[PDB]
Paper text:
We demonstrate the capabilities of our method by studying the dynamics of the rhodopsin ErNaR (Erythrobacter sp. ErNaR belongs to a recently identified subgroup of the NDQ rhodopsins, which feature an additional glutamic acid residue close to the retinal Schiff base, allowing ErNaR to efficiently pump sodium ions even at acidic pH. Samples of ErNaR are activated with a nanosecond laser pulse of 532 nm wavelength (6 ns FWHM pulse duration, 6.4 mJ/cm2 fluence) and jet vitrified at 107 μs and 13.3 ms, to probe the K2 and O2 states, respectively.
We analyze the structural dynamics of ErNaR at the level of a monomer (C5 symmetry expansion), neglecting potential cooperativity between the subunits because of the small amplitude of the motions involved.
Numbering used by the authors:
A (entry chain D), B (entry chain C), C (entry chain E), D (entry chain B), E (entry chain A): 1 to 245, 246A, 247 to 272
Amino acid sequence: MPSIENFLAYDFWQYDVIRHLFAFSTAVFLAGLVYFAMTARTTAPNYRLSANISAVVMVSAALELGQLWLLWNESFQWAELQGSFVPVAGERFSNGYRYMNWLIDVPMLATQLVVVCGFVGTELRNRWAKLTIAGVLMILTGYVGQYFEPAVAGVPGYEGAEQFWIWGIISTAFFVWMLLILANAVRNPQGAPSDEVRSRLKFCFWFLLATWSIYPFAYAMPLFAPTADGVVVRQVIYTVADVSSKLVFGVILSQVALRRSAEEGFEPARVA
Amino acid sequence: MPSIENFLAYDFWQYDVIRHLFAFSTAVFLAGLVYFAMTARTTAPNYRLSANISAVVMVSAALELGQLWLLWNESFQWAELQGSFVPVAGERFSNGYRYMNWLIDVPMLATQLVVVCGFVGTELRNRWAKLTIAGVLMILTGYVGQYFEPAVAGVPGYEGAEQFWIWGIISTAFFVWMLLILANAVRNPQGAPSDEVRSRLKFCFWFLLATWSIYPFAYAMPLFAPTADGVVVRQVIYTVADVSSKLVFGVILSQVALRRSAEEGFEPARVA
Amino acid sequence: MPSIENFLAYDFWQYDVIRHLFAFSTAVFLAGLVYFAMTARTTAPNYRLSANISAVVMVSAALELGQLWLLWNESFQWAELQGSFVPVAGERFSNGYRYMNWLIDVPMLATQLVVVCGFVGTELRNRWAKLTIAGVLMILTGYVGQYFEPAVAGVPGYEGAEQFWIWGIISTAFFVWMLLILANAVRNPQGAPSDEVRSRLKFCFWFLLATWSIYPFAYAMPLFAPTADGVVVRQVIYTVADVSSKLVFGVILSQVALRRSAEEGFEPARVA
Amino acid sequence: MPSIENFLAYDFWQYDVIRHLFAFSTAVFLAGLVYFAMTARTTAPNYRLSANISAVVMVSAALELGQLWLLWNESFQWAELQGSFVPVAGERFSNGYRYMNWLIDVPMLATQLVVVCGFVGTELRNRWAKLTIAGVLMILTGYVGQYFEPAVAGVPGYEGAEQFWIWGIISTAFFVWMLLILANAVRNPQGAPSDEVRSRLKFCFWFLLATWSIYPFAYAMPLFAPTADGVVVRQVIYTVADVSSKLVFGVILSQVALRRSAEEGFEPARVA
Amino acid sequence: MPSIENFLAYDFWQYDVIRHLFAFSTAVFLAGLVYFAMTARTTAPNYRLSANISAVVMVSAALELGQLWLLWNESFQWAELQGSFVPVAGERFSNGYRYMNWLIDVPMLATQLVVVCGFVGTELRNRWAKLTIAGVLMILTGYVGQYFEPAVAGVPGYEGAEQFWIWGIISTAFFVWMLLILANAVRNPQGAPSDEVRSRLKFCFWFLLATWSIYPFAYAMPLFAPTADGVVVRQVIYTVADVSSKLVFGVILSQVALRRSAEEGFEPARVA
Ligand SMILES: CCCCCCCCCCCCO[C@@H]1O[C@H](CO)[C@@H](O[C@H]2O[C@H](CO)[C@@H](O)[C@H](O)[C@H]2O)[C@H](O)[C@H]1O
Ligand SMILES: CCCCCCCCCCCCO[C@@H]1O[C@H](CO)[C@@H](O[C@H]2O[C@H](CO)[C@@H](O)[C@H](O)[C@H]2O)[C@H](O)[C@H]1O
Ligand SMILES: CCCCCCCCCCCCO[C@@H]1O[C@H](CO)[C@@H](O[C@H]2O[C@H](CO)[C@@H](O)[C@H](O)[C@H]2O)[C@H](O)[C@H]1O
Ligand SMILES: CCCCCCCCCCCCO[C@@H]1O[C@H](CO)[C@@H](O[C@H]2O[C@H](CO)[C@@H](O)[C@H](O)[C@H]2O)[C@H](O)[C@H]1O
Ligand SMILES: CCCCCCCCCCCCO[C@@H]1O[C@H](CO)[C@@H](O[C@H]2O[C@H](CO)[C@@H](O)[C@H](O)[C@H]2O)[C@H](O)[C@H]1O
Ligand SMILES: CCCCCCCCCCCCO[C@@H]1O[C@H](CO)[C@@H](O[C@H]2O[C@H](CO)[C@@H](O)[C@H](O)[C@H]2O)[C@H](O)[C@H]1O
Ligand SMILES: CCCCCCCCCCCCO[C@@H]1O[C@H](CO)[C@@H](O[C@H]2O[C@H](CO)[C@@H](O)[C@H](O)[C@H]2O)[C@H](O)[C@H]1O
Ligand SMILES: CCCCCCCCCCCCO[C@@H]1O[C@H](CO)[C@@H](O[C@H]2O[C@H](CO)[C@@H](O)[C@H](O)[C@H]2O)[C@H](O)[C@H]1O
Ligand SMILES: CCCCCCCCCCCCO[C@@H]1O[C@H](CO)[C@@H](O[C@H]2O[C@H](CO)[C@@H](O)[C@H](O)[C@H]2O)[C@H](O)[C@H]1O
Ligand SMILES: CCCCCCCCCCCCO[C@@H]1O[C@H](CO)[C@@H](O[C@H]2O[C@H](CO)[C@@H](O)[C@H](O)[C@H]2O)[C@H](O)[C@H]1O
Ligand SMILES: *C/C=C(C)/C=C/C=C(C)/C=C/C1=C(C)CCCC1(C)C
Ligand SMILES: *C/C=C(C)/C=C/C=C(C)/C=C/C1=C(C)CCCC1(C)C
Ligand SMILES: *C/C=C(C)/C=C/C=C(C)/C=C/C1=C(C)CCCC1(C)C
Ligand SMILES: *C/C=C(C)/C=C/C=C(C)/C=C/C1=C(C)CCCC1(C)C
Ligand SMILES: *C/C=C(C)/C=C/C=C(C)/C=C/C1=C(C)CCCC1(C)C
């Protein structure tokens, strides 16, 4: 079913704020792509893969936000008589456009964290495979669940509110599995890290946890506040979570990777 | 004739999922282009051509999926009364937009496999020529066959279902010729490869065989499930095949090429 | 509420000038992105972050202006009978689209100034954190205030003119806090700068203060000139401020950074 | 006058094929741009200009095909009752959008061939000048002639069929002049080329002659087959000629330039 | 007032040629961007600023022509009954869209000429400042003047023909001031240039003078030939002037800069 955004009329500022959020996020991710591309070579070869993954995540996020921006603009039009933006006839907005891109983002973010933790070769491949399986199952179950949010929001005609809960809970279990893999990786770093590096890797894990925990809250938003205000708040928290989880986490992880490159004698890392 | 996608009405989730699949694949291929471009120079000069071909394939795939996404959005519109996305009056969706880009993708993928296998000069040129001839004939025959899809699906007023079978079978024969060439290349690697390299090249051949085999199934889908559910499944399998056979195959092949560069003494490959 | 631009009819030259301004600013920022990307590596590694932040700012600004240009074109249409561009029925223009991109621009600009001042590590992080907090609060308060501009302009049916003043004043206080932080950074440069560097850093502070001060005037324009002429002058001052405070400030700051790099023995900086 | 494409109704497969051709060629040329930009530095500096020109040609061709694709999509719409794509009311397709871009492509292609032939300095400038004059006159005369193709095709109400022949013949004379310059350049290479280089340069000249000769046939198609089938054949041969004469010719010329760089001692060329 | 292009009906070839010119120029400038970006590092660091300015000019020109192309397509539509492209109801074309981008182009072009003349530091800054002031005043006065071209063309209901003359004459005076500055720079080159460099710098001055002089003629076209043929010829001379004054001028200037770099011992310049 269509997302809860399609069953509401929006005041000008509500709609304006949401479209600004999508534009801004797209700008953030394109600028982050430029930044990571310009700075990747400062990281040592053995960690550069994390810098490259950051670039990849920026590309994915830029496109996902840009398509949300496009769809948001196309799905609603101003109605002067009501003083509100209202659904257009032939288009329907979907918040699910972000979920399929998370298939790229989430595994990549976890993998780059494992990379900076120092895992290589088969250990790296195995942790990447576990993180991809868990993340993909989490995203797909949440993606199924998010198609029932008009039902769970009590919009007349729509049925299947229990599917929302069921698929959300299954996705939560897979989220816990990913968090357990990442905790094991951040606690068992390879390559003889310094105490500062160990603490920074732990902080990176906790930052990832805090930022990723926002997404289930936005998923549950139709249950709590199925209003225009709730939609605005949901888009705001998506914007905070997206920017933090991808760009800010990438910047922090790059700082950790640069510290490890410096501690291993990478001259560009040391001068920078 | 118009593809079977034009003769069905879509529930919101079906149409939504297909548009998300096209957007997601476009994002995957643009991010893959960025990745390959940033990492190509880690491969030794004598294998860098494969890394370059990967970049080329990403470009081709990005545009082919983006045009699919555009056309999908333009060809259908929401209908509130029916609660379904229905075909628009002036536009018709086509699934054949992917076929012509395969003219780039398929020879390039096979070629880069032959490259990493160590064939150079005239031996390389001869394998590239054979792979291009076989692949172009395969793609063109399947392309002709895919225009009789509504006829083979039993849509009234459409004739020529036998053409679907005939051109699909001819394309299958050319596919077998491609596979035979690639098997001879993966079994006769040049440049004195290590046992690990040989096994990884064989795995690459089998991965290509497995991922390319999804395309004839997707081609056959109008026969087995000419429904909206069958269309969704078709697009999902295309997404899996596209992502695997281009991006994941490129990553695996870059790993083999990097290992061969390391074993030949390429220092960037060895440090990385 | 919709910005004051939506409540006026525009002569051809007024509308034409505004759309030319948006397009020209977009061109300026894309060209600046190309320039800074091509020139970043001339700055020494310990100051290259400023060159990178300039690239980031150019990206942000390019998209912010391009989206304003798109919206401006979409929100109004020619009406030959009146000889004027008038609001279209289904779209409303918003000047607030620039405000969310300022979230990127303003902290980045301040930070790159602090970088060229020579602050590193935790001192850098702390100043970046203060400048981001102050700038985000400033931008968000001004963004809230700018939604009441038809009310402050005396357009009938719109209430809440006092919110315009209140949020503008709060934003002014946060602006003063940012200016104080930047004055402390520019007055306490690190790394033993030369007298010429010290004076150029002070000039960069005053240039930032002068260019940033145009934004509150543009914010106040609905109060003084809620006409088509006032809209034109607003957009002209916005263009001047955008170009100066981002591109010209980046060029001047790159010159200071290059001078510091030369002083510290960076050979690319010295030859250039 | 409008091109002959505007006076026909198209079956779905005819229209579909043509749009696929334009999109495919655009993808080819963008991929080619990525490839040439990634590989230009492998050529020695005294031949790198040809690699740069290949990149330029790719850019030009990509845009020329993308605009043809756009216009083709806009100029026609599906009509379900007739089962055909028919011209829209407000738009007309033009095949002349390619001709103006040839002003870039044709001189550049000839010039890069002269470059790889070894001509430098004033001799290079003189051959570039002659090739540009001849090619520009060729393109402009053919461009004038192509505006009379509805007349030459016998579409009622259109006069001036003799202009088609006259301007085509004048363009053919200028084509012969260009071929004569290129033949003299490839028969008198500079810089003491090896026999393989000499033969490969002669091959490149004959390849250019073969691929460029398709364009007058496509120009003459309105005369022989002013039908939808003839339109499809025209676009197909344009696609073959475009791809060959730009991309494949560039690849082959890069191979010659690489061989000459290896024979003059350019290490990157020798390792690759 | 709307440009004279809005008050005429266009034959198919006239409208077709104009849209081809806009597209072709956009392609030229994007290809120029790619060329200058790929070749900038061949110039020595003390002259590489000119190469960077060429890249910047390409960006600006590409966007300006692209927007003229877009606006041209949107402002007119085919009318089968009249056999002509006629103005659409809700859009009006503006030739002034190039003027604001000239704010970037003209100072940059003059400045890069002064750079290759060898002026550095404060002397360079002073000449850049004079050139920017004169050029901005020139462009703004001509921009004001070009808003009266329907009046000067004698279209009924439009007054103010004298403003066209007045602002054109003031802009001509500022053009003369620019030319005087550039003549002083080209006649007093720094860095002890060779006689060949001195003569090539003088030729660059005369080439700039010849190509820039076309713009006042195009500005005067509404007075001489306010017809569809006059519009076509104006766009043609705009295309010639744009290509020559930006791309061709950049190529010639890069040749002078390369010769100076080689004379000063820049090895990449000498090998290339
Ligand atoms: C959407 C586009 C995504 C493209 C890239 C995806 C990367 C996913 C990483 C999966 C982790 C498991 O497999 C891992 O793969 C990476 C990338 O090939 C390999 O990485 C290797 O190549 C890259 C360059 O290609 C080097 O920077 C790295 O130092 C080197 O080890 C690891 O040796 C391997 O262990
Ligand atoms: C609109 C957005 C666009 C621009 C956004 C730019 C993002 C910039 C992010 C800057 C990074 C912040 O810097 C980060 O600060 C935290 C502060 O706790 C530091 O963390 C530090 O303190 C914590 C406290 O618990 C310790 O656990 C950790 O070991 C220590 O290093 C990180 O090591 C550092 O990387
Ligand atoms: C859509 C864009 C496609 C662009 C690239 C197409 C590649 C097609 C490969 C065909 C294989 C046969 O021809 C082969 O061509 C490649 C590319 O010129 C040549 O490759 C040569 O140039 C490339 C590029 O500088 C080097 O990375 C490589 O090391 C070198 O051998 C081979 O020596 C030749 O044997
Ligand atoms: C969705 C967006 C895209 C995200 C990014 C995707 C990146 C994908 C990276 C995949 C890496 C796979 O890595 C690949 O794993 C297989 C696992 O069998 C390894 O293969 C290994 O086992 C097989 C048997 O199973 C042997 O035949 C082979 O010789 C051996 O090396 C490959 O040597 C390795 O290259
Ligand atoms: C919208 C995308 C923006 C992304 C980039 C934002 C960077 C500015 C944030 C400043 C936060 C303060 O924290 C600061 O972070 C930067 C960036 O990691 C670090 O910078 C470090 O890495 C960069 C490359 O990544 C090097 O050029 C620099 O020399 C080095 O010090 C500083 O050591 C740290 O003190
Ligand atoms: C149309 C788009 C816009 C295009 C803009 C193109 C780039 C603009 C480049 C501007 C360069 C300005 O250059 C800047 O000039 C000022 C002039 O006061 C110099 O400043 C100099 O004088 C001031 C006093 O006036 C002193 O306080 C300062 O210490 C001294 O260096 C700066 O050291 C120099 O960096
Ligand atoms: C629209 C975007 C335009 C962005 C760039 C505009 C440049 C215009 C320069 C005009 C003159 C200003 O003054 C001049 O500025 C340039 C650019 O900082 C400085 O140039 C300095 O840095 C650049 C890189 O940033 C080097 O290539 C150059 O060798 C070096 O001298 C000159 O030392 C100074 O004399
Ligand atoms: C769908 C888009 C496709 C994208 C990718 C396309 C890549 C195209 C790569 C083409 C490579 C062809 O490679 C080219 O082969 C011919 C074969 O006659 C060789 O030519 C060779 O044989 C001919 C035979 O008459 C001799 O005249 C010539 O002297 C000799 O060198 C060229 O030396 C080589 O450069
Ligand atoms: C659609 C178009 C896209 C592609 C366009 C490509 C542009 C290529 C431009 C080629 C460069 C022209 O080359 C230029 O020729 C003139 C010819 O007078 C030379 O000039 C030479 O002769 C003149 C007199 O005529 C002397 O004053 C000068 O000192 C001398 O060098 C320039 O030194 C050279 O730089
Ligand atoms: C349309 C996009 C831009 C097109 C740019 C390319 C146009 C080339 C046309 C050839 C004109 C003949 O004149 C020729 O010009 C080229 C390009 O400046 C010069 O080439 C010189 O600069 C280039 C670029 O730095 C170097 O790769 C080359 O090694 C060097 O010789 C030749 O010395 C000169 O003889
Ligand atoms: C950049 C995108 C990111 C980091 C996305 C992260 C997404 C999640 C952590 C998703 C979590 C989910 C659950 C735990 C429950 C509800 C369903 C999901 C998929 C939203
Ligand atoms: C990235 C795109 C790829 C790898 C495409 C591959 C396509 C095939 C292997 C196509 C095969 C076909 C047949 C064997 C039978 C039916 C017709 C085709 C063309 C779909
Ligand atoms: C590139 C964008 C820049 C430099 C934006 C700067 C914005 C400001 C300095 C904002 C100032 C404000 C006030 C001081 C009062 C009115 C509200 C604001 C947000 C416009
Ligand atoms: C990439 C574009 C290319 C190689 C274009 C080439 C064009 C020609 C060789 C044009 C030839 C013409 C004639 C000889 C006669 C008919 C008119 C022309 C312009 C099509
Ligand atoms: C790339 C764009 C360029 C070089 C533009 C140049 C513009 C001029 C030389 C403008 C000249 C003018 C006058 C001298 C009189 C009439 C008004 C102007 C602005 C067109």
